[PDB]
Design a protein around this ligand. Sequence first.
Ligand SMILES: *[C@@H]1O[C@H](CO)[C@@H](O[C@@H]2O[C@H](CO)[C@@H](O[C@@H]3O[C@H](CO[C@H]4O[C@H](CO)[C@@H](O)[C@H](O)[C@@H]4O)[C@@H](O)[C@H](O)[C@@H]3O)[C@H](O)[C@H]2NC(C)=O)[C@H](O)[C@H]1NC(C)=O
Ligand SMILES: *[C@@H]1O[C@H](CO)[C@@H](O[C@@H]2O[C@H](CO)[C@@H](O[C@@H]3O[C@H](CO[C@H]4O[C@H](CO)[C@@H](O)[C@H](O)[C@@H]4O)[C@@H](O)[C@H](O)[C@@H]3O)[C@H](O)[C@H]2NC(C)=O)[C@H](O)[C@H]1NC(C)=O
Ligand SMILES: *[C@@H]1O[C@H](CO)[C@@H](O[C@@H]2O[C@H](CO)[C@@H](O[C@@H]3O[C@H](CO[C@H]4O[C@H](CO)[C@@H](O)[C@H](O)[C@@H]4O)[C@@H](O)[C@H](O)[C@@H]3O)[C@H](O)[C@H]2NC(C)=O)[C@H](O)[C@H]1NC(C)=O
Ligand SMILES: CC(=O)N[C@@H]1[C@@H](O)[C@H](O[C@@H]2O[C@H](CO)[C@H](O)[C@H](O[C@]3(C(=O)O)C[C@H](O)[C@@H](NC(C)=O)[C@H]([C@H](O)[C@H](O)CO)O3)[C@H]2O)[C@@H](COS(=O)(=O)O)O[C@H]1O
Ligand SMILES: CC(=O)N[C@@H]1[C@@H](O)[C@H](O[C@@H]2O[C@H](CO)[C@H](O)[C@H](O[C@]3(C(=O)O)C[C@H](O)[C@@H](NC(C)=O)[C@H]([C@H](O)[C@H](O)CO)O3)[C@H]2O)[C@@H](COS(=O)(=O)O)O[C@H]1O
Ligand SMILES: CC(=O)N[C@@H]1[C@@H](O)[C@H](O[C@@H]2O[C@H](CO)[C@H](O)[C@H](O[C@]3(C(=O)O)C[C@H](O)[C@@H](NC(C)=O)[C@H]([C@H](O)[C@H](O)CO)O3)[C@H]2O)[C@@H](COS(=O)(=O)O)O[C@H]1O
Ligand SMILES: *[C@@H]1O[C@H](CO)[C@@H](OC2O[C@H](CO)[C@@H](O)[C@H](O)[C@H]2NC(C)=O)[C@H](O)[C@H]1NC(C)=O
Ligand SMILES: *[C@@H]1O[C@H](CO)[C@@H](O[C@@H]2O[C@H](CO)[C@@H](O)[C@H](O)[C@H]2NC(C)=O)[C@H](O)[C@H]1NC(C)=O
Ligand SMILES: *[C@@H]1O[C@H](CO)[C@@H](O[C@@H]2O[C@H](CO)[C@@H](O)[C@H](O)[C@H]2NC(C)=O)[C@H](O)[C@H]1NC(C)=O
Ligand SMILES: *[C@@H]1O[C@H](CO)[C@@H](O[C@@H]2O[C@H](CO)[C@@H](O)[C@H](O)[C@H]2NC(C)=O)[C@H](O)[C@H]1NC(C)=O
Ligand SMILES: *[C@@H]1O[C@H](CO)[C@@H](O[C@@H]2O[C@H](CO)[C@@H](O)[C@H](O)[C@H]2NC(C)=O)[C@H](O)[C@H]1NC(C)=O
Ligand SMILES: *[C@H]1O[C@H](CO)[C@@H](O[C@@H]2O[C@H](CO)[C@@H](O)[C@H](O)[C@H]2NC(C)=O)[C@H](O)[C@H]1NC(C)=O
Ligand SMILES: *[C@H]1O[C@H](CO)[C@@H](O[C@@H]2O[C@H](CO)[C@@H](O)[C@H](O)[C@H]2NC(C)=O)[C@H](O)[C@H]1NC(C)=O
Ligand SMILES: *[C@@H]1O[C@H](COC2O[C@@H](C)[C@@H](O)[C@@H](O)[C@@H]2O)[C@@H](O)[C@H](O)[C@H]1NC(C)=O
Ligand SMILES: *[C@@H]1O[C@H](CO)[C@@H](O)[C@H](O)[C@H]1NC(C)=O
Ligand SMILES: *[C@@H]1O[C@H](CO)[C@@H](O)[C@H](O)[C@H]1NC(C)=O
Ligand SMILES: *[C@@H]1O[C@H](CO)[C@@H](O)[C@H](O)[C@H]1NC(C)=O
Lengths: 330, 317, 321, 173, 172, 172
Amino acid sequence: PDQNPTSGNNTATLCLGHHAVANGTLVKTITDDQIEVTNATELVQSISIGKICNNSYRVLDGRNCTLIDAMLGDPHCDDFQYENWDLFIERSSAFSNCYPYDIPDYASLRSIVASSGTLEFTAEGFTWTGVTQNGGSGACKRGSADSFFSRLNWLTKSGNSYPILNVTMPNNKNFDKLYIWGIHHPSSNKEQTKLYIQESGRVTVSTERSQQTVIPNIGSRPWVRGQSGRISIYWTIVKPGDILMINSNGNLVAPRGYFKLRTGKSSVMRSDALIDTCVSECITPNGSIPNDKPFQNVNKITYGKCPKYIRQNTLKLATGMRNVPEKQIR
Amino acid sequence: NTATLCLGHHAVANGTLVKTITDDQIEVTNATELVQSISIGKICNNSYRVLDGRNCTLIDAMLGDPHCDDFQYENWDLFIERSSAFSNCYPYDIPDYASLRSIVASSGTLEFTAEGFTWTGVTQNGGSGACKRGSADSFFSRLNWLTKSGNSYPILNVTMPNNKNFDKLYIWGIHHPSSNKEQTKLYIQESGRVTVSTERSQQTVIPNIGSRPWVRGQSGRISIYWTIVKPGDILMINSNGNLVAPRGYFKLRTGKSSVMRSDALIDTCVSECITPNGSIPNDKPFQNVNKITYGKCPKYIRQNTLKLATGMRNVPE
Amino acid sequence: NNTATLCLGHHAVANGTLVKTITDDQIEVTNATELVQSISIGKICNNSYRVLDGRNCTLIDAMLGDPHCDDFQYENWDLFIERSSAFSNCYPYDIPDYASLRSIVASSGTLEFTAEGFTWTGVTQNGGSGACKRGSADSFFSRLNWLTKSGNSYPILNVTMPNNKNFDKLYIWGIHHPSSNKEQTKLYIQESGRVTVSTERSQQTVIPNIGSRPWVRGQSGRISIYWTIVKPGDILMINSNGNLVAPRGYFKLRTGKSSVMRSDALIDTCVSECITPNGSIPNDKPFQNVNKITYGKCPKYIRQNTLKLATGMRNVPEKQI
Amino acid sequence: GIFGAIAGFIENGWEGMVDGWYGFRYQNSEGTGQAADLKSTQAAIDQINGKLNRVIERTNEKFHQIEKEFSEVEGRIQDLEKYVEDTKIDLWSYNAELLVALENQHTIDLTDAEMNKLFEKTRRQLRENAEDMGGGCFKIYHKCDNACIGSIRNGTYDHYIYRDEALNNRFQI
Amino acid sequence: GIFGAIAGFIENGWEGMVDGWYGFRYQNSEGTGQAADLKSTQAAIDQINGKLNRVIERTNEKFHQIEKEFSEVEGRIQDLEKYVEDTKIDLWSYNAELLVALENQHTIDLTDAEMNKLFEKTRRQLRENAEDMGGGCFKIYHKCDNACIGSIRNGTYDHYIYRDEALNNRFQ
Amino acid sequence: GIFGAIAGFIENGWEGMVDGWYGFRYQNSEGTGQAADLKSTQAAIDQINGKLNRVIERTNEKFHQIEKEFSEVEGRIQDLEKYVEDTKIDLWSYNAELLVALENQHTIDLTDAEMNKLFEKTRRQLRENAEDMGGGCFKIYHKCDNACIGSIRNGTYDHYIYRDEALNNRFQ
Ligand SMILES: *[C@@H]1O[C@H](CO)[C@@H](O[C@@H]2O[C@H](CO)[C@@H](O[C@@H]3O[C@H](CO[C@H]4O[C@H](CO)[C@@H](O)[C@H](O)[C@@H]4O)[C@@H](O)[C@H](O)[C@@H]3O)[C@H](O)[C@H]2NC(C)=O)[C@H](O)[C@H]1NC(C)=O
Ligand SMILES: *[C@@H]1O[C@H](CO)[C@@H](O[C@@H]2O[C@H](CO)[C@@H](O[C@@H]3O[C@H](CO[C@H]4O[C@H](CO)[C@@H](O)[C@H](O)[C@@H]4O)[C@@H](O)[C@H](O)[C@@H]3O)[C@H](O)[C@H]2NC(C)=O)[C@H](O)[C@H]1NC(C)=O
Ligand SMILES: *[C@@H]1O[C@H](CO)[C@@H](O[C@@H]2O[C@H](CO)[C@@H](O[C@@H]3O[C@H](CO[C@H]4O[C@H](CO)[C@@H](O)[C@H](O)[C@@H]4O)[C@@H](O)[C@H](O)[C@@H]3O)[C@H](O)[C@H]2NC(C)=O)[C@H](O)[C@H]1NC(C)=O
Ligand SMILES: CC(=O)N[C@@H]1[C@@H](O)[C@H](O[C@@H]2O[C@H](CO)[C@H](O)[C@H](O[C@]3(C(=O)O)C[C@H](O)[C@@H](NC(C)=O)[C@H]([C@H](O)[C@H](O)CO)O3)[C@H]2O)[C@@H](COS(=O)(=O)O)O[C@H]1O
Ligand SMILES: CC(=O)N[C@@H]1[C@@H](O)[C@H](O[C@@H]2O[C@H](CO)[C@H](O)[C@H](O[C@]3(C(=O)O)C[C@H](O)[C@@H](NC(C)=O)[C@H]([C@H](O)[C@H](O)CO)O3)[C@H]2O)[C@@H](COS(=O)(=O)O)O[C@H]1O
Ligand SMILES: CC(=O)N[C@@H]1[C@@H](O)[C@H](O[C@@H]2O[C@H](CO)[C@H](O)[C@H](O[C@]3(C(=O)O)C[C@H](O)[C@@H](NC(C)=O)[C@H]([C@H](O)[C@H](O)CO)O3)[C@H]2O)[C@@H](COS(=O)(=O)O)O[C@H]1O
Ligand SMILES: *[C@@H]1O[C@H](CO)[C@@H](OC2O[C@H](CO)[C@@H](O)[C@H](O)[C@H]2NC(C)=O)[C@H](O)[C@H]1NC(C)=O
Ligand SMILES: *[C@@H]1O[C@H](CO)[C@@H](O[C@@H]2O[C@H](CO)[C@@H](O)[C@H](O)[C@H]2NC(C)=O)[C@H](O)[C@H]1NC(C)=O
Ligand SMILES: *[C@@H]1O[C@H](CO)[C@@H](O[C@@H]2O[C@H](CO)[C@@H](O)[C@H](O)[C@H]2NC(C)=O)[C@H](O)[C@H]1NC(C)=O
Ligand SMILES: *[C@@H]1O[C@H](CO)[C@@H](O[C@@H]2O[C@H](CO)[C@@H](O)[C@H](O)[C@H]2NC(C)=O)[C@H](O)[C@H]1NC(C)=O
Ligand SMILES: *[C@@H]1O[C@H](CO)[C@@H](O[C@@H]2O[C@H](CO)[C@@H](O)[C@H](O)[C@H]2NC(C)=O)[C@H](O)[C@H]1NC(C)=O
Ligand SMILES: *[C@H]1O[C@H](CO)[C@@H](O[C@@H]2O[C@H](CO)[C@@H](O)[C@H](O)[C@H]2NC(C)=O)[C@H](O)[C@H]1NC(C)=O
Ligand SMILES: *[C@H]1O[C@H](CO)[C@@H](O[C@@H]2O[C@H](CO)[C@@H](O)[C@H](O)[C@H]2NC(C)=O)[C@H](O)[C@H]1NC(C)=O
Ligand SMILES: *[C@@H]1O[C@H](COC2O[C@@H](C)[C@@H](O)[C@@H](O)[C@@H]2O)[C@@H](O)[C@H](O)[C@H]1NC(C)=O
Ligand SMILES: *[C@@H]1O[C@H](CO)[C@@H](O)[C@H](O)[C@H]1NC(C)=O
Ligand SMILES: *[C@@H]1O[C@H](CO)[C@@H](O)[C@H](O)[C@H]1NC(C)=O
Ligand SMILES: *[C@@H]1O[C@H](CO)[C@@H](O)[C@H](O)[C@H]1NC(C)=O
């Protein structure tokens, strides 16, 4: 009869065919914007773990401190005194709490110190004859007493004298010394002559290769932590065999020593993400991401072993044939 | 009792050649050009807002060169600077001119707002025969040239807080006299100074006495500077001489506007892509007209022609 | 028999070569061709392009006129070679934005110099130094003129030089920074120096910087070099009342395809259209792995050291042997 | 073409087929005839239209950028501003050169494909009632009028109807 | 598909086939049955795994780079930093979009190819003992129980055993 | 490759065949022989040479650029310089990796295709006088001597001469 499951005794039917699924997934091709296959895999990473994992690279939480403030030695950043990192994290809630300053080419110094990956500092016996040392301010309280940046030495008149300061300090080491120094811009002529005797200061930090000369700039600025004066930070890099020399007849904010510069693979990143015990070879401001996929849509800013940032949030790679379902109606 | 059934494909009299992976030239039934190589010849104005600078550079229009007064509160998607543009006010330079030009161009607006700066002990609104506004001596409309009142020029100490929620652009400068006699005549003090500062940043400038080349009667010069003051912050200006004071602030937008150099005519038409040569259509993926572009533009490439096949291999009799 | 068997097939080789594909990391084909240049000749070939050996000189010292660099007085080049062994043996100096000036001259590819008769009345000229010995005489950079006080005083200098040409002039000038105020007064009278090089488009004021520095060839003083480009119609002007190291003239600025390169490789005769610091390379392959720094008609630098392009079919050898 | 139908075992194209890309020509007891196959034509066109839609009018929106022509000679950072733009243009020029080459090699192979598909489809319907003469032509071994031919073009040709007649003509002589 | 097998002369796929990607369905004197082909299935999966290996877990290490977000407005140099990053991102976005387009077109084509290869392989085994019905189906013109079908699936089917019987049912 | 002829239904290549890329082997009444097919061979080579033209001696001329090695640390504008060059190199590295990949995949698929084309061209000539044995081999069902084989190789084999002989051998 018609439900006979066999063939007609002298023949047989053999059919060749392929599998299919009830729920395919759409992928893009050269000819088709959307064409359905049996399945696919996502090539774009668009989800973050939500936090910065810290077991892979050494991540250092700056907390209330920028990398520059930690370097200069802002009292409340004294816990970052001799530290190092693969990645330094700067928070949006960070703040400065010492004497108000500006750094010409702030971004470059930040980069230089960040790539080096270390704040290891070494003091040096700079002989400052004829001047008062360790100047302090109420805008920079270490404890309840007036103080200053810990890596800087605010020099002022000793009695009736502020001589032409003439100091050397050679680099007999096998690495580049980074020296941080500055100049004080006072608020008024009366204050300039009071602190430095001379009417118009000067600062000349130099080596055999390079030199920088800076002149103070009298005039009141906005009040910041009770102070109308300002300080400008500059840097000088001294190579092995070379020799630092500092000359000044006024307004010098001198260095106490050098920072050790390394050729490094370290960096700095701005993020408010929690840092936690987990493992991930790629960090973004949003948090860590896995790096199984070749691309990512989380953030163009990344550190580590990361997928490449693209605009697309999804790209599907077919891992199966065209899906041609059995039932037209389900 | 038999029949022949032949299968075949079509063909066209004269096809067109294309490049493949294996062929330099192979003939197909049809193809379509993928490089836009011709231009309309003029800039179309009914897509984006285009502004003809005419005889004025963006910077001059900002500063307020008398002959650029027409631009006072203007705004644009694209500002066109002409090669016949010129300056016709006090001679001036702007250290890092390109950056100020970029910043203003991107903001896309000269929306200026005067502010009551309190300049006491000086005479304001200085003028020059090199910057005539009508028959009278004048100066850049957005700049205020201060000189001594009576027999003195005090240490000016003026401030202006930013209570808005946008960044304020402040344009200022310093005057460089042509002699020591001129310095003391206008400003009393033998050495000038201008310190414009915020809580985060500062800029100090000393003038520099001595003559320069002759420009519209004057050997003196001014140098233009700017300060961007953020919301919550505060502008302070301290100076005991040579200040060319600001009159107010420009309003900075984070806009999608820009500036472009072109001598192309501007006319009624439609096209969402602008180049110095003129507007071009954007139907094709690439172009070879100019790397300088604004709007929805094809990507610039070196090749002037790339034929994409839209048909099969053409094989005639 | 009255039948026959007709078999088809393809050729094959004993040992083929492995290549990459979409679906296979390694798959054997009959033949392939290398698309990355890995090895170089070892010498810089000086036959396609004009290669000029700096030897002990840098492009910048040559431009200024360091006594030992007087060989390069009026010379041009496609590619200027700088050796790691080069030195400066004249007055100790620095240059703000050194790299830029080096790049501008290098690109121009020429040290063509036309002297001009600047008049410096009230001042003594052609100042020398023991750090910069020409022969055995206290001399100076050949293109710069060190001005000092004429016995009694040093007046406000004011000299002009208009551009009659149809091309840009490159003026090189500087300013001296003394080691003490007793010097500043001795040499230039005024306790405060100042230099103002202006044009009808632009201006630069530089102020000297008194104070001692480390001794370079006996000298505590220093010089800072500057430059001013001048355009057709535009008029150069130089105001100064001290410390001016004046220019003797201008360099012509050509817009050219020239450059500068750092290398310690031998320069020798050979055929090659592409130059690297390691030596010249052949440009038959599309890519190369020798050095990202290149000049001439060069393959594109990539990180891979080998990439085999298949020039034949899938090699399927017979296993019957 | 990778299947060797177009510019292969089919010797040339029919210029006089103006209402389709692929189709039939036949000779039988009613005369000669020609007809476009709309299905294999539409396949090729759709794919080619797909290529177009992913290449055509997919333009970027771009506003303020960097400067690219300069009055003055400036040195270091102008070097960089030119090197960047030059590096970009060279890269996009490569991409466009390659894209076209690839898409065109493919357009040729997929058009060649549709021709071969139509052939094999037709061969399957005819079964034991026809042999392949070459040149893309089938010899059909039975009377096959325009309706019979129409049924082949429709894909409703019932080979059992003619099988007896056809097997008799093939194994004759 | 370029061979017109999948979504072509084979009307549709089989949802009941969970043991493979390609296979057989048969009717014979014992009933109807289903069986996967592991060799063709494996060929397709291996090529697709090759693509995955080329693309999955392949990432460069990068460390300090440039800034890409800015607090203040600066002008020329910030423009350049932004343009550089914006240029790089556009080129990588294009690479990814094209990588996926080509690979998917190829994947679809190579699975269609393995379906066609399997048919052509089977056709060769049956030689003069079967005819193409269409729809990827063979009518076998001799009695072929489950052992007999299995020998075709194993590739040990000797067509000479049934040739005379088959020819006589094909033509008579 | 994608047609499954090479490394497919043809078991392996012939090292002995040195005068061409594709060809014929045969046994018959005059013993056995081998001969290369020139049209098919040339078609593959012409395609492959085509690719070489797109890649070999296609070089750009560049002059002054940017500095790519550095003595001192400078920070910002040096970070940008190194990042630009680094960005450029990875993109070209990718371009190179992908080119070689797509080309070699395509070189394998087009050389396989030509093998198949040659097979289908021979199949159409022989018409009903031969059957596909498998292994890329035909069983011709009549006394086909070297002159007869030559005609197949030359594309001038007239099947109507041998039909009634061969048709009789296949079915009896
Ligand atoms: C140049 O002009 C400047 C401003 O026009 C002058 O600076 C001003 O000097 C006064 C007097 O010394 C300062 O007064 C101080 O302000 C702090 C700020 O406190 C704020 O918060 C508390 C919260 O309770 C509130 O009480 C205040 O109203 C403020 O909102 C006060 O705590 C003290 O009164 C303190 O004395 C101004 O702060 C300061 N302003 C600025 C902008 O610098 C400057 O003296 C002039 N210079 C010269 C040379 O004449
Ligand atoms: C430092 O030296 C400079 C050069 O010696 C001095 O600059 C010159 O100063 C005098 C004033 O004492 C100016 O005299 C004026 O010259 C213009 C000429 O302008 C142009 O147009 C006219 C008309 O078409 C044409 O005749 C000329 O060729 C010019 O092209 C006259 O129009 C005025 O009436 C007046 O005579 C010089 O113009 C000026 N030259 C430059 C280049 O600046 C400077 O004064 C000296 N400083 C000191 C302190 O001594
Ligand atoms: C401010 O302090 C500066 C740093 O201390 C002073 O600079 C020093 O000045 C003295 C001379 O007053 C220089 O000494 C000279 O050195 C040279 C060369 O040194 C080598 O000499 C021989 C030969 O090779 C050998 O013994 C060693 O290799 C020496 O290194 C001698 O040839 C001279 O005779 C003389 O001794 C110092 O070199 C110099 N120091 C530096 C770091 O340059 C400066 O005098 C002070 N200035 C003011 C205005 O007060
Ligand atoms: C009139 C009134 O209501 N009150 C005044 C106070 O203004 C005055 O306080 C001092 O004001 C001076 C400026 O005139 C300084 O701001 C000073 O601040 C210090 C600081 O930073 O803490 C004091 C430090 O000892 C100084 N450190 C040094 C020299 O190393 C430091 C420094 O001079 C400046 O910051 C440089 O710009 O300033 C305020 O304490 C008060 C005391 O007067 S004074 O100290 O004798 O000048 O007098 C009231 O009448
Ligand atoms: C034959 C003869 O020499 N007669 C003299 C005139 O030279 C003298 O003209 C003035 O010369 C001075 C240079 O010392 C200026 O060029 C001045 O021009 C202005 C100008 O138009 O730009 C006049 C403006 O009123 C000034 N604006 C101010 C102060 O805000 C402006 C300014 O001082 C300079 O631009 C600053 O560099 O200069 C010529 O008018 C004429 C007038 O003498 S004076 O002005 O009372 O000193 O008197 C005969 O001496
Ligand atoms: C008293 C004592 O202990 N020693 C001095 C020696 O210093 C003096 O040698 C001179 O030292 C001075 C230091 O101020 C200079 O370095 C000078 O060198 C020259 C030079 O560079 O060759 C000499 C040039 O003629 C000067 N060039 C000029 C004026 O255009 C040049 C110039 O002043 C500086 O470069 C400016 O920075 O300095 C050494 O000659 C030694 C010789 O005596 S004398 O002073 O030269 O007449 O005797 C002592 O009294
Ligand atoms: C960051 O800065 C805070 C401000 O001084 C500091 O101290 C306090 O933290 C919270 C702020 O809401 C309060 O408990 C209180 O104001 C402060 N408490 C003190 C000083 O004892 C935070 O501790 C700082 N953060 C870190 C991680 O050190
Ligand atoms: C990585 O981050 C974790 C989480 O902050 C650090 O571990 C914490 O250390 C503090 C004391 O410093 C403890 O009070 C917490 O209990 C610790 N973990 C957690 C999850 O609460 C860890 O020290 C960081 N650094 C490294 C190198 O692992
Ligand atoms: C569009 O304008 C640009 C810029 O002016 C043209 O580039 C010039 O082309 C001419 C003609 O070959 C050259 O002589 C100049 O050297 C080029 N000038 C500059 C400044 O680069 C470009 O050819 C124009 N393109 C068009 C009309 O399609
Ligand atoms: C390329 O530079 C080389 C390096 O010196 C030149 O080779 C020698 O040049 C010297 C100086 O004239 C001759 O005395 C030698 O005989 C040269 N050859 C050798 C092997 O030392 C060479 O002449 C330069 N060629 C060109 C075309 O500039
Ligand atoms: C070409 O020369 C460069 C130097 O310009 C060589 O670069 C060095 O490569 C080695 C590889 O072992 C590295 O370890 C060094 O750090 C590199 N040094 C510098 C300064 O870049 C390069 O190896 C040479 N390449 C060749 C001959 O192919
Ligand atoms: C097809 O691809 C999907 C999605 O990529 C595969 O799902 C993964 O399968 C592995 C192995 O079982 C799991 O470990 C992963 O967790 C899966 N990933 C995701 C995102 O779901 C799936 O295995 C493949 N096959 C089928 C039949 O779907
Ligand atoms: C294929 O392999 C090699 C190397 O790829 C080839 O050897 C050369 O032949 C080419 C012909 O184009 C010439 O350019 C050179 O003379 C040879 N060496 C090269 C390019 O390195 C040859 O074409 C083939 N096989 C051989 C020789 O066994
Ligand atoms: C192939 O088939 C022969 C027929 O018997 C079967 O046995 C099992 C393996 C089933 O899966 C089907 O193949 C048939 O019903 C076997 O006798 C023979 O051993 C098999 N050979 C191989 C190599 O698998
Ligand atoms: C062929 O291409 C042209 C030009 O791109 C286009 O107008 C149209 O699509 C086609 N026209 C004809 C006649 O085929
Ligand atoms: C196809 O054509 C034949 C004869 O012309 C006819 O019998 C049949 O109904 C047609 N079928 C369709 C679907 O058009
Ligand atoms: C090819 O083959 C035949 C038979 O070997 C030979 O006689 C003839 O000369 C050849 N002709 C052509 C056209 O190739």
